[PDB]
mmCIF file of N, CA and C and ligand atoms in Angstrom:
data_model
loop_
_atom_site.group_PDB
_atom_site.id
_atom_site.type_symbol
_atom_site.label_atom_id
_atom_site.label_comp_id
_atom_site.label_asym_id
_atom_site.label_seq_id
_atom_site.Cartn_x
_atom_site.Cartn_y
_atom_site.Cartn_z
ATOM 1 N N UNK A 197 211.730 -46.710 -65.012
ATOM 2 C CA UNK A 197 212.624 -45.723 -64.423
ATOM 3 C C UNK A 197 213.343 -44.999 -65.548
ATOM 4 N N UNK A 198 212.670 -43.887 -65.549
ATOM 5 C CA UNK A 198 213.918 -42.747 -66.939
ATOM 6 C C UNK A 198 214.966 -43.311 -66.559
ATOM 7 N N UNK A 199 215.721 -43.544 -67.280
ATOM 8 C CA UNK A 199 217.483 -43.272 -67.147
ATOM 9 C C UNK A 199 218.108 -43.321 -68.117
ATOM 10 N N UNK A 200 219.598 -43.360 -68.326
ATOM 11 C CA UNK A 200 220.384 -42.810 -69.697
ATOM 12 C C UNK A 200 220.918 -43.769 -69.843
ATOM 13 N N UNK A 201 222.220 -43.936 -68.828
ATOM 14 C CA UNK A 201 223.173 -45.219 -68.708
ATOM 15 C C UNK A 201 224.163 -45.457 -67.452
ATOM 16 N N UNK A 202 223.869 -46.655 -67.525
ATOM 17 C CA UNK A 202 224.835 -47.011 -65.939
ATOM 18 C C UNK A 202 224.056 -46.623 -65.032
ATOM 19 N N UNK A 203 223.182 -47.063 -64.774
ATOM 20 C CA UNK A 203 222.414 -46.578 -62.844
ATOM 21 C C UNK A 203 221.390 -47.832 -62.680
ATOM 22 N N UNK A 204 222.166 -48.807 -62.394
ATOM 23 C CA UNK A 204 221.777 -50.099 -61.854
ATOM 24 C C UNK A 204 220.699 -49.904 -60.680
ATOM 25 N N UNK A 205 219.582 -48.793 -60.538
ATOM 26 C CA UNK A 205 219.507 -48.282 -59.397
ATOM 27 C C UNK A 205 217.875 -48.610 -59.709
ATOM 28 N N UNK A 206 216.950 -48.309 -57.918
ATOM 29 C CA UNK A 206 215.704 -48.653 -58.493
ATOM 30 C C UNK A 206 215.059 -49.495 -57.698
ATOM 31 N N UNK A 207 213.956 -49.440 -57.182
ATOM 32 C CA UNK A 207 213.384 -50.215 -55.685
ATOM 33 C C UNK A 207 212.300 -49.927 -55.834
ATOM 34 N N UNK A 208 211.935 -51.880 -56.065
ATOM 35 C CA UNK A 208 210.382 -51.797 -55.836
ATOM 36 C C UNK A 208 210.550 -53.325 -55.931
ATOM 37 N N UNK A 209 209.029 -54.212 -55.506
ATOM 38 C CA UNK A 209 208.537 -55.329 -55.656
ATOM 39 C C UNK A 209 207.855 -55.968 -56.923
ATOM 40 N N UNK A 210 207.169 -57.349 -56.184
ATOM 41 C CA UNK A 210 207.404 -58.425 -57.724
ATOM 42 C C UNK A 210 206.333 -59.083 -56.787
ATOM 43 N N UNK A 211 205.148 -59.736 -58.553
ATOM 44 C CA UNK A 211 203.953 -60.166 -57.153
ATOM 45 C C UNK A 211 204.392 -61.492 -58.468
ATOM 46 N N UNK A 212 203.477 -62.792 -57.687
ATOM 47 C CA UNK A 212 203.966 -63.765 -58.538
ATOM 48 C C UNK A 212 202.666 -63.895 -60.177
ATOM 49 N N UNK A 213 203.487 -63.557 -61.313
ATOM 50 C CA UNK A 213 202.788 -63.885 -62.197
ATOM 51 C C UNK A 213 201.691 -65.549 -62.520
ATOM 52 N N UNK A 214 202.770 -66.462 -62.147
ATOM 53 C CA UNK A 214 202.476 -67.618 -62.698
ATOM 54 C C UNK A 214 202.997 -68.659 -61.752
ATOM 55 N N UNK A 215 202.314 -69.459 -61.073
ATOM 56 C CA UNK A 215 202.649 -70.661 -60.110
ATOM 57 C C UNK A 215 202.432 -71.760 -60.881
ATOM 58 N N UNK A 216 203.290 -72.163 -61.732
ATOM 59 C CA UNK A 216 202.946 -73.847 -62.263
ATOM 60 C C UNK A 216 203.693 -74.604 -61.327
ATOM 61 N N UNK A 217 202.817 -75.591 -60.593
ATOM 62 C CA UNK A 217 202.835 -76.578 -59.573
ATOM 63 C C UNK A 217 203.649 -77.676 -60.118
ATOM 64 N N UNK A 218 204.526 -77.286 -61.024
ATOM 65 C CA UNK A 218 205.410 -78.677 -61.318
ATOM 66 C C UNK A 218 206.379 -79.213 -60.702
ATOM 67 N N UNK A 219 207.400 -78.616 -59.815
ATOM 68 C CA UNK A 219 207.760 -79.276 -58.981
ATOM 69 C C UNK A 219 209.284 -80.335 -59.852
ATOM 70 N N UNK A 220 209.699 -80.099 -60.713
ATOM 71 C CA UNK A 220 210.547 -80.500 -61.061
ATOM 72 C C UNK A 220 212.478 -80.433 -60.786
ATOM 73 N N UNK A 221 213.260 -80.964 -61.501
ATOM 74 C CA UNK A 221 214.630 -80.875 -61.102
ATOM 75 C C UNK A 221 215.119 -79.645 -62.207
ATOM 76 N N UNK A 222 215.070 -78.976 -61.039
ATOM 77 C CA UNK A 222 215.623 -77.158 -61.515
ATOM 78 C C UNK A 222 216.942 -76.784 -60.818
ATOM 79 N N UNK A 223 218.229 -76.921 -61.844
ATOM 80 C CA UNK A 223 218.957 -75.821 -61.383
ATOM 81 C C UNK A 223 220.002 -75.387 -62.522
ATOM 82 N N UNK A 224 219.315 -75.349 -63.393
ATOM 83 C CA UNK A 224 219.556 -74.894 -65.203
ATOM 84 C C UNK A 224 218.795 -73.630 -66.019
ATOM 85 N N UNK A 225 219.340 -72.789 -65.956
ATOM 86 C CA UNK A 225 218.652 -71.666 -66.626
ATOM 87 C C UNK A 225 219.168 -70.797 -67.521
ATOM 88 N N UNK A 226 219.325 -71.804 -68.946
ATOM 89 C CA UNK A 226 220.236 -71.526 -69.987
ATOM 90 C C UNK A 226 219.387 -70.254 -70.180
ATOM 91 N N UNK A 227 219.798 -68.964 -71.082
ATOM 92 C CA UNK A 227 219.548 -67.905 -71.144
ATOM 93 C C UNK A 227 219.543 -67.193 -72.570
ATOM 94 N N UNK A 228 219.205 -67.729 -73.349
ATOM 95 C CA UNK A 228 219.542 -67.386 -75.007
ATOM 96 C C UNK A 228 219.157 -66.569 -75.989
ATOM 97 N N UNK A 229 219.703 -65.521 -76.458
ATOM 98 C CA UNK A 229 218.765 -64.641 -77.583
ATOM 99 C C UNK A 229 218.463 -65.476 -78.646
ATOM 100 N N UNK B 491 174.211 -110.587 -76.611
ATOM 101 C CA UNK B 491 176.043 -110.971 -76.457
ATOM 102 C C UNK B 491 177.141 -109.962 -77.053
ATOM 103 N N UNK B 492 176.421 -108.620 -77.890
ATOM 104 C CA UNK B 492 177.357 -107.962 -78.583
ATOM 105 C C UNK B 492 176.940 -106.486 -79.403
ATOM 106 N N UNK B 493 175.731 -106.798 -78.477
ATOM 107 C CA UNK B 493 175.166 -105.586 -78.535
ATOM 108 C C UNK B 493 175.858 -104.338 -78.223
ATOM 109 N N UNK B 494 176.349 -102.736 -78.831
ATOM 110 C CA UNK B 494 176.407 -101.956 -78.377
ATOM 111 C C UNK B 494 176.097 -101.468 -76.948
ATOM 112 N N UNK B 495 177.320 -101.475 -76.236
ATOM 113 C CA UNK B 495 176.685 -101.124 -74.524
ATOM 114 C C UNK B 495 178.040 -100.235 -74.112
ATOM 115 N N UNK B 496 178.399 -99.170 -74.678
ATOM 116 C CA UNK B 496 179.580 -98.855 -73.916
ATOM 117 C C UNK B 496 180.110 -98.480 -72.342
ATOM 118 N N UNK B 497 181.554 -98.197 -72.298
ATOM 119 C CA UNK B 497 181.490 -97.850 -70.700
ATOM 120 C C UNK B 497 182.931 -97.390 -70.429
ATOM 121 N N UNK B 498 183.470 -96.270 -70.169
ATOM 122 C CA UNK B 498 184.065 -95.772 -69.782
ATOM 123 C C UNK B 498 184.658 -95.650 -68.365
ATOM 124 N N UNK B 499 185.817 -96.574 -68.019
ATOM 125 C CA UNK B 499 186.081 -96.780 -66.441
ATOM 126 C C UNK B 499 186.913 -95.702 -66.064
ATOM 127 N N UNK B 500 187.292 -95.460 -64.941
ATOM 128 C CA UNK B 500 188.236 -94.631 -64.568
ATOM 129 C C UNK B 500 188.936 -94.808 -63.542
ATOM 130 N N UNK B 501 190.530 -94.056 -62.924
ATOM 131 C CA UNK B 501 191.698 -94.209 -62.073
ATOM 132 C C UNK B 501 191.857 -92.981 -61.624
ATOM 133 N N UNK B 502 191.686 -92.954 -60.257
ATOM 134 C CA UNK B 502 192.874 -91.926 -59.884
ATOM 135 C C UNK B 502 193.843 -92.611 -59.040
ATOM 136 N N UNK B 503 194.804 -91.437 -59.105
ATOM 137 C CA UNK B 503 195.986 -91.546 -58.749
ATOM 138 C C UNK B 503 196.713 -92.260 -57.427
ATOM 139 N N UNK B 504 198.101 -93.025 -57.079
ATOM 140 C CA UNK B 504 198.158 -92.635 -55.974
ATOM 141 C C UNK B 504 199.246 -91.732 -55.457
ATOM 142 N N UNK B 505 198.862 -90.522 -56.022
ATOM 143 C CA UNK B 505 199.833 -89.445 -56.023
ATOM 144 C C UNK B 505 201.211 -89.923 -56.356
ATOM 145 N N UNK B 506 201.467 -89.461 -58.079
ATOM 146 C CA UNK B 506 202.025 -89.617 -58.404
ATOM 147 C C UNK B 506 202.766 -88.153 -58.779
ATOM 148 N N UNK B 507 201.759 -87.580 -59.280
ATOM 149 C CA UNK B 507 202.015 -86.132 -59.190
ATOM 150 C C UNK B 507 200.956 -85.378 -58.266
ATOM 151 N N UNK B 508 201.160 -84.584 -57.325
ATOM 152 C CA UNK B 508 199.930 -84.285 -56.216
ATOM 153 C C UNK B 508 198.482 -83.275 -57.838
ATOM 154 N N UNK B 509 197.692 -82.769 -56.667
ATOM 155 C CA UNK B 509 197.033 -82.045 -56.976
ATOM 156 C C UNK B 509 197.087 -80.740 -57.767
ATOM 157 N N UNK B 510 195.901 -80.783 -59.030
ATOM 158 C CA UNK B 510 196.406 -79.591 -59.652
ATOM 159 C C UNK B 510 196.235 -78.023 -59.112
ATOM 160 N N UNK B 511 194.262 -78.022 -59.410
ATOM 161 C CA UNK B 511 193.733 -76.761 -59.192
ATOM 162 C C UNK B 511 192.706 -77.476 -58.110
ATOM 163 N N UNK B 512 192.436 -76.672 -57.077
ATOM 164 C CA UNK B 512 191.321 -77.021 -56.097
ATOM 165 C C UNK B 512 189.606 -76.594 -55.999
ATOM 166 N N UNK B 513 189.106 -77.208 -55.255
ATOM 167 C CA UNK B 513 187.184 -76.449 -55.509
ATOM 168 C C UNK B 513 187.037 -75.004 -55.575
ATOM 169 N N UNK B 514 185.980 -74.873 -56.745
ATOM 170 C CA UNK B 514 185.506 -73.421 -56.669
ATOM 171 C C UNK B 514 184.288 -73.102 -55.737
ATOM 172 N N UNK B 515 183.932 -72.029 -55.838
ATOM 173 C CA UNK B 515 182.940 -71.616 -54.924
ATOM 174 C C UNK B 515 181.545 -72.558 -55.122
ATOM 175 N N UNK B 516 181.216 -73.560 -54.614
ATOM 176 C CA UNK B 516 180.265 -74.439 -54.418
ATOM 177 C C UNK B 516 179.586 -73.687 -53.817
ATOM 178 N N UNK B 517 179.112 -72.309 -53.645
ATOM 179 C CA UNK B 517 178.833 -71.844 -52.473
ATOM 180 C C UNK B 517 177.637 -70.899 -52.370
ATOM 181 N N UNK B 518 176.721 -70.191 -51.557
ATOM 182 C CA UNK B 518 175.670 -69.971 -52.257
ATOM 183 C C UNK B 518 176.206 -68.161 -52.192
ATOM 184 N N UNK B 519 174.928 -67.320 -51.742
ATOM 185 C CA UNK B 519 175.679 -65.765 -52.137
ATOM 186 C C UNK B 519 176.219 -65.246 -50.514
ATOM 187 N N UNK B 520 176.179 -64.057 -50.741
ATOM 188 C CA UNK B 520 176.621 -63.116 -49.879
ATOM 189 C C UNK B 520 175.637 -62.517 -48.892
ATOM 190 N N UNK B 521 176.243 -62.445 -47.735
ATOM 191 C CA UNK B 521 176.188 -61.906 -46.311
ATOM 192 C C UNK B 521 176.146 -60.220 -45.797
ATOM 193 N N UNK B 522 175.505 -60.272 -44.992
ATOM 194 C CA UNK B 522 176.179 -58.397 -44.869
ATOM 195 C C UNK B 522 175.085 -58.590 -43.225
ATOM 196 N N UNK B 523 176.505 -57.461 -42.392
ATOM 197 C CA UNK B 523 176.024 -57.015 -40.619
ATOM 198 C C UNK B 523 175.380 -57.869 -39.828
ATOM 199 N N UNK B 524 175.389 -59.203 -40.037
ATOM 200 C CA UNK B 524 174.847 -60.188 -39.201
ATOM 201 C C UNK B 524 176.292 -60.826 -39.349
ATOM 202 N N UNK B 525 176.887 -61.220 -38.187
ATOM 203 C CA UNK B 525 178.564 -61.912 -38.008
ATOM 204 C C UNK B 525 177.919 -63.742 -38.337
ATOM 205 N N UNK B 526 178.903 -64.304 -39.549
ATOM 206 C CA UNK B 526 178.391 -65.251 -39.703
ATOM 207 C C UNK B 526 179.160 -66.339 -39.909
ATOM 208 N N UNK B 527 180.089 -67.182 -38.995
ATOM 209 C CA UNK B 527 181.041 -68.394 -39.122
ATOM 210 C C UNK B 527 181.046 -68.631 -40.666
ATOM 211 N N UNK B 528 182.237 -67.848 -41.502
ATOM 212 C CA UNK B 528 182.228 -68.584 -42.843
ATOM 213 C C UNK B 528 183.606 -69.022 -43.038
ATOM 214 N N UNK B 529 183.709 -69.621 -44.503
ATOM 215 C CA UNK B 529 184.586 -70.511 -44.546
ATOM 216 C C UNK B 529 185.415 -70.076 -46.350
ATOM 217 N N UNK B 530 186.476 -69.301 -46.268
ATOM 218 C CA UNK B 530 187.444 -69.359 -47.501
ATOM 219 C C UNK B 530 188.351 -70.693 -47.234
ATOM 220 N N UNK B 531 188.699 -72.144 -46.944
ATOM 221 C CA UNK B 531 189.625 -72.330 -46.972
ATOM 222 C C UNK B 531 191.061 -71.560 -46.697
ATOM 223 N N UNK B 532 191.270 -70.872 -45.856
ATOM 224 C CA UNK B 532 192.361 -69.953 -45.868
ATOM 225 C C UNK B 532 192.069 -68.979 -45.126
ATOM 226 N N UNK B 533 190.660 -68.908 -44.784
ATOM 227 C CA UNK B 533 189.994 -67.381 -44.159
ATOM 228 C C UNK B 533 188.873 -67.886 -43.899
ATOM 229 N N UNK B 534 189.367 -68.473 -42.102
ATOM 230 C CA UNK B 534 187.592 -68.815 -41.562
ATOM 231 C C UNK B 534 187.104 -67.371 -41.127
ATOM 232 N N UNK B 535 186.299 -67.040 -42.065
ATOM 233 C CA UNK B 535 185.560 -66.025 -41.795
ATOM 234 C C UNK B 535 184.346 -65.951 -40.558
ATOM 235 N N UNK B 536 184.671 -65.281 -39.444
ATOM 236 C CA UNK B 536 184.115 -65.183 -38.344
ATOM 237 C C UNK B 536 183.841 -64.022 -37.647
ATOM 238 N N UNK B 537 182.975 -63.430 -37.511
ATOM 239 C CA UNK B 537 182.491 -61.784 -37.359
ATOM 240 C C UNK B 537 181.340 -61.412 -38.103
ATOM 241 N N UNK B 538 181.240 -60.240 -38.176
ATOM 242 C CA UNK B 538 180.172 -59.248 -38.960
ATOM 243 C C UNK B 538 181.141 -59.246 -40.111
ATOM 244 N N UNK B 539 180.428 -58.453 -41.131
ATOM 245 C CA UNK B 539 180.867 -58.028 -42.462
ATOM 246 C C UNK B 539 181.246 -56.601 -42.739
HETATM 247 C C1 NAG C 601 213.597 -84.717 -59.795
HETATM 248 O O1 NAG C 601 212.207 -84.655 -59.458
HETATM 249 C C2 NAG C 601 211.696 -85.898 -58.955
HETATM 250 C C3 NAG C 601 210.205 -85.751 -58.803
HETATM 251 O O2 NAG C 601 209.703 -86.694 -57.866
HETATM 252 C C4 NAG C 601 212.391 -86.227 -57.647
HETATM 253 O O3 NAG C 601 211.869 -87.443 -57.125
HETATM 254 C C5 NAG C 601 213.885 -86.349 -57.899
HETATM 255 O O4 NAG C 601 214.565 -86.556 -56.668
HETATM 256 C C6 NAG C 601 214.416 -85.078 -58.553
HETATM 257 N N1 NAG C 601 215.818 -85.234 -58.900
HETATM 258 C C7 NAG C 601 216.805 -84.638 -58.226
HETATM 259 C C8 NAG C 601 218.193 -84.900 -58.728
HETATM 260 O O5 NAG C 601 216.589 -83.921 -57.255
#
């Protein structure tokens, strides 16, 4: 989407890249540069 | 008594972790305008083509 700045804006979908069947204890999603 | 004889046993699981990836196409070819009971797992294919 062109844009400049500030326009949080924008509609569309998401297909699933990657299904790893792991099944684990998830509710941590440290985020780090 | 000690002769070279190897042998490789094996285990599966009792679901400990389920299943990974499932069967591929075991399957032979393709169909066309004759409707023919088939089978995707997911898509009983039933009709013409
Ligand atoms: C973590 O995953 C295991 C996998 O079997 C599950 O049994 C366990 O309950 C999970 N832990 C939590 C806190 O949900």
């Amino acid at each position: 989407i062109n844009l400049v700045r500030d326009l949080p804006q924008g509609f569309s979908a998401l297909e699933p890249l990657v299904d790893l069947p792991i099944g684990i204890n998830i509710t941590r999603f440290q985020t780090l540069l | 008594g000690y002769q070279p004889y190897r042998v490789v046993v094996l285990s599966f699981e009792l679901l400990h972790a389920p299943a990974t990836v499932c069967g591929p196409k075991k399957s032979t070819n393709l169909v066309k305008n004759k409707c023919v009971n088939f089978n995707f797992n997911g898509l009983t294919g039933t009709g013409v083509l």
